[PDB]
Amino acid sequence: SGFRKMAFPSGKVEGCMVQVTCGTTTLNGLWLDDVVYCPRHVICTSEDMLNPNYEDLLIRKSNHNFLVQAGNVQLRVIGHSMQNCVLKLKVDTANPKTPKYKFVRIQPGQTFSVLACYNGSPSGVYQCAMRPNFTIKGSFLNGSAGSVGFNIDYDCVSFCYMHHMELPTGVHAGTDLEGNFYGPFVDRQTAQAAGTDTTITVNVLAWLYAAVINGDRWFLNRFTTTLNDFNLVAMKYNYEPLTQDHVDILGPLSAQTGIAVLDMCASLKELLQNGMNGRTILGSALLEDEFTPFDVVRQCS
Amino acid sequence: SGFRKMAFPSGKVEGCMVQVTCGTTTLNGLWLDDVVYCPRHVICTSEDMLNPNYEDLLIRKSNHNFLVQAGNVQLRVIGHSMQNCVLKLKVDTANPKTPKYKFVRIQPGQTFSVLACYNGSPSGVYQCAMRPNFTIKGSFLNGSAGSVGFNIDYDCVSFCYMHHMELPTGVHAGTDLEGNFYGPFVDRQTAQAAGTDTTITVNVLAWLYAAVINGDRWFLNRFTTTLNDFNLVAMKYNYEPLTQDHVDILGPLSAQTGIAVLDMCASLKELLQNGMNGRTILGSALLEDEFTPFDVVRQCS
Amino acid sequence: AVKLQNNE
Amino acid sequence: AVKLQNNE
């Protein structure tokens, strides 16, 4: 028992991480088979970051301009391309450590593990959700661009996120591995703001189920509510609407605990209307929304 | 910026993890050079776990009784020994993936990363503190014994924890890699309880510094307090005394932020006496005590 | 009431 | 005010 924010083991991703340098600009790249993927703003100079014309910059570069370090081993670039906001740097040497992998784009409300790196060297691993407003609330300093987010299924690494940049509010923005940004953002050092965020209701309910599985029962009650009457309360507190498909996804957890989904919603309503009154749930005094139903089933089962 | 509970990258430890089976009892082992380390209760039968005589059980075993799987590869046991509460199973094959490593015993209040495994297979990685009462509040199910906790320094893995068992309160207990338990516990399925826990004050202060580094300033004030007058308040709220050496360790963070340590203590006193009044710090409505000063410097720097 | 966390 | 998080 116990419930912690748990990342996937990061070994398979650590062996893919390289350093990429253009002149005095450096960041991380992802080395799979004979291609290194990295954020395209590695070709910007310090003063060309307010509105880079990435087509200029790339046509004026040559292969020998790209320094790729895989630890101590320098890697020879033998081809370069741009794909949306990432570069694909072809290299002569295929990565012997390439795991089986997929490029997937994730949905807001889904979680993934982040391997934060600096100068091609893994620094730490932690768990993130994609927020309804397409930002992530990560932990990233200068040098972290090119760090990737991922999920692991049996032996398959599904890469879903490459880090690019920090917004002024302190949250983070990036692309899928195909170079298309999550959310309405661009890779330029301009004023950009996220839309207003909401709370991921299905996740809060899943975390309430994790709590009940771990012995926290004080917020339970015997009232039930209807789906529409719960959504009226949700909208009032800036939670996203709950759908019938959310109720279905919660089925396994409703079955294991014997607490019907709409019964749990009555508890949630009460917590939103009343607060927690100095008690806690799974070591938190706020409602946590960064565990999916899958994440709960994964730990508690 | 941003502040998350971050584990160390786990690749170097993943390549050491094996499965160990005695009859119908199975758990995880740690394979370094030509030795597999694992919890000794792997030699208990289901009905011999209320008061096993581990000397009986071990003398009645032979090498061929120990099934060690390193993935698909079965490993031959060619010698077995007991060291306090762990077994050292000598094997014929040295682990080619053995990293540079150390066995260290940690102090209450220090943190480490846990690679949770089942049946020799890594399942997840997360960050834990050793509580003042020598328990850890982990996330562990049946099959997790033999999972290890560790810190990483440059290339060196310092193993500090091997998991053995869950207490009735839901918290976790184990040994150092030398087999000596943390805290007043034994590897038997009897009634055992931890002593009363306290809050790790130096960690709470370090986390307040992380908050200020990340822009959270609302709890600051201009009062100062003396070391003795703060400790009077600490003891009232079940926090551990703060020492001069804690003040010194906090020096780098006091310097970076320009908030003197005893000034921060005045803020802490206020938070303990008044609560947070619906505001939050680094996404928490409670005071977090599981980040060391080192952990803060590591992320924010 | 302690549970040693081997399996099966 | 966005910061691209390369280094140097």
Torsional class of A119: left (φ above 0), alpha (ψ -120 to 50), beta (otherwise): left
Q: Please report, for the domain that includes residue A245, its CATH number.
A: 1.10.1840.10
Buried residues in A176-195 as b, exposed as e (16+ CB within 10 A): bbebebbbebebbbeebebe
DSSP C7: B
- Number of cross-chain residue pairs from B and C with Cβ atoms under 8 Å apart: 60
List all residues 6 or more positions away from A73 whose beta carbon is below 8 Å from its beta carbon.
none
Going by C-alpha positions, the residue among B60, B72, B71 that lies closest to residue B22 is B60
Identity at B239, one-letter amino acid code = Y
CB half-sphere exposure, A272, CA atoms < 13 A:
21
The reply to whether residue C5 touches residue B140, judged by beta carbons under 8 angstroms, is yes
Tokens 């786990």, residue located: B10
The dihedral formed by the CA atoms of A245, A248, A253 and A258, expressed in degrees to the nearest 10: 130
Q: Is the dihedral of CA B216, B219, B220, B224 positive or negative?
A: negative
What is the rounded CA–CA span in Å between residue B38 and residue A280?
36
**Structural determination approach:** X-ray
Which residues, other chains included, contact B72 with Cβ-Cβ below 8 Å and sequence gap of 6+? none
Structure tokens at B101: 């490593």
Question: What CA–CA distance (Å, rounded) separates A296 from A288?
Answer: 12
* Chain B positions in Cβ-Cβ contact with residue A166 (cut-off 8 Å): 1
Residues of B in contact with C5 (CB under 8 A): 27, 140-145, 163-166
- Tell me whether residues B143 and C3 touch, CB distance under 8 A: no
C-alpha neighbours within 13 Å on the C-beta side of residue A196 = 4
CB burial string A45-60: b at 16+ within 10 A, e below: eeebbeebebeebeee
Residues A95, A31: contact at Cβ < 8 Å? yes
Task: Read off the amino acid at residue A198.
Answer: T
Q: Look at A140 and D5 and tell me if their CB atoms are within 8 Å.
A: yes
Residue with tokens 């008690």: A279
Q: How far is A124 from chain D (nearest CA, A)?
A: 16
With contact defined as 3+ CB pairs under 8 Å, the chains touching A are: B, D
Return the residue of A nearest to B15 by Cα.
Answer: A11
Taking a C-beta distance cutoff of 8 angstroms, is the pair B169, B193 a contact?
yes
CA–CA separation, A174 and A30 (whole Å):
14
CA distance A125 to A113: 7
CB–CB contact B167 C8 (8 Å): no
Residues in chain A: 301
Q: Are C2 and B144 a contacting pair at CB < 8 A?
A: no
Collect all residues of chain B within an 8 Å Cβ-Cβ radius of residue A116: 6
> Helix/strand/coil (H, E, C) string of chain A?
CCCCCCECCCHHHHCCEEEEEECCEEEEEEEECCEEEEEHHHHCCHHHCCCCCHHHHHHCCCHHHCEEEECCEEECEEEEEEECCEEEEEECCCCCCCCCEEECCCCCCCEEEEEEEECCEEEEEEEEECCCCCCECCCCCCCCCCCEEEEEECCEEEEEEEEEEECCCCCEEEECCCCCECCCCCCCCCCCCCCCCCECHHHHHHHHHHHHHCCCCCCCCCCCCCHHHHHHHHHHCCECCCCHHHHHHCHHHHHHHCCCHHHHHHHHHHHHHHCCCCCCECCECCCCCCCCHHHHHHHHC
Cα distances (angstroms) measured from residue B259 to each of A275, B117, B267, B284, B300: 33, 42, 11, 21, 16
Place of tokens 């998080």: D5
- Domain membership of residue A293 as a residue range: 201-300
What is the phi-psi region of residue B278: left when phi exceeds 0, alpha when psi lies from -120 to 50, beta otherwise? left
Classify residue B66 by burial, with Cβ atoms within 10 Å: 0-12, 13-18, 19+: buried
Phi, psi of A165 (to 5 degrees): -165, 165
Amino acid at B285: A
> Between A1, A9, A170, which is nearest B124 by CB?
A9
Write the CA distances from A124 to A200, A296, B298, integer angstroms: 26, 23, 10
Residues 6+ apart with CB under 8 A from B216: B281, B282
Tell me, what CATH number does B32's domain have?
2.40.10.10
Out of C2, C6, C7, whose CB is closest to B192? Answer: C2
| Beta-strand pair A73-75/A67-70 | antiparallel
Residues in chain A within 8 Å Cβ distance of D8: 24-26
Q: Name the minimum distance, in Å, from the CA of C8 to any CA of chain B.
A: 6
| C-alpha distances in Å from residue B102, one per residue of A286, B19, B35, B174, B230 | 39, 22, 14, 18, 38
Q: Judge contact between A164 and A41, C-beta under 8 A.
A: yes
Residue A196 tokens read as: 């207003």
Q: Residue A14 is which amino acid?
A: E
| Contact residues of A toward D, CB < 8 A | 24-27, 39, 41-42, 44, 49, 118-119, 140-145, 163-168, 173, 185, 187-192
Residues 6+ apart with CB under 8 A from A84: A175, A178, A179, A180
Of residues A293, A290, A292, A13, the one with CA closest to residue A125: A13
- DSSP track, chain B: ------BPP-HHHHTTEEEEEETTEEEEEEEETTEEEEEGGGG--GGG-SS--HHHHHHT--GGG-EEEETTEEE-EEEEEEETTEEEEEESS--TTPPPEEE-PPPTT-EEEEEEEETTEEEEEEEEE--TTS-B-----TT-TT-EEEEEETTEEEEEEEEEEE-TTS-EEEE-TTSPBSSS--SSSS---PPPP-B-HHHHHHHHHHHHHTT--TT--S----HHHHHHHHHHTTBPPP-HHHHHHTHHHHHHHT--HHHHHHHHHHHHHH--TT--BTTBSS------HHHHHHHH-
Which positions in chain D have a beta carbon within 8 angstroms of at least one beta carbon in chain A?
1-8
**With contacts defined as CB-CB under 8 Å, which chain D residues touch A141?**
5
Of the candidates B239, B232, B171, B235, which has an alpha carbon nearest to the alpha carbon of residue B199?
Answer: B239
Contact list, A147 vs chain B (CB under 8 Å) = none
SS3 C3: strand
Can you tell me whether residue D7 is helix, strand or coil? strand
d(CA A220, CA A202): 17
3-state secondary structure of D4: strand
User: Inter-chain contact C8–B25, Cβ cutoff 8 Å?
Assistant: yes
3-state SS, residue C4: strand
Place of tokens 């990036």: A174
Q: Among candidates A14, A2, A7, A49, which has minimal Cα distance to A213?
A: A2
